[PDB]
Amino acid sequence: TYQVIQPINGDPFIGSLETPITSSPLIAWYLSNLPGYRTAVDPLLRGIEVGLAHGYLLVGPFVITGPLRNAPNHGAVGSLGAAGLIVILSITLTMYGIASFKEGDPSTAPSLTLTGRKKVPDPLQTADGWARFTGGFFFGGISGVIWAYFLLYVLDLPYFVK
Amino acid sequence: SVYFDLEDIANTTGQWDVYGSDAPSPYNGLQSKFFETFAAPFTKRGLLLKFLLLGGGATLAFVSSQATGDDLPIVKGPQLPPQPGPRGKI
């Protein structure tokens, strides 16, 4: 008949399976267009995008659920907490990069596509690439926290939940 | 029909990049130049770790030292007369 689930890349002895969750064209395109999988571009810009998303998303919970949520100063306090969390995350990223990558070693990323075509391995899995990524992450996260604060409590836009 | 090649161990063991994309940069040139210029100082991992740890510690200490009684109940202090002890102790 017609079966949907197939072995990964046609190899039945690799510990994975091809399912609509993992191999559908829409999800494949979406994952390929995320900054974490853009192999052929400077990791600094990708880290900028990642930090801009994450620091922006982190503002809400700190501002609204925090201890000073009912104070008139709740927005600034929550934004400061989100910035501190971004700083801690950047520290963790730097620690991982220092522990994982030596300066002279080449990339640990795969050099083959699913079709067996040779490609340039991702420079994100090198010391310099990871350093650029975490610097971009810090710069983007601080900017995203500041932008969320500016949109919520400097222009005071009529957001339903603030 | 065969998935075992001695000349290609990466293909044999599944060393593939599944969602990796080799497409060019989708970002605008001016924006990339701006970010490259203004994020360059943070790309030194040795400097970044020391700066983050020391500056974060100093900022935490400074903010804790500048907190008022409105922000922290511990800074406000007691406002009520103290309770007495079980058998007259103070």
């Binding site: 522990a99 | 770790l49 510690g57 935490l60 804790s64």
Partner: peptide
């Protein structure tokens, strides 16, 4: 005076620095 400065240092900053140093030590080689 001092407690407001010292408590964050001993409770947060010093453990973080020590953890980072120890992790970098144990991940060596």
């Amino acid at each position: 005076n001092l407690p407001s400065i010292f408590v964050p240092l001993v409770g947060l900053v010093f453990p973080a620095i020590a953890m980072a140093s120890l992790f970098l030590h144990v991940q060596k080689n």
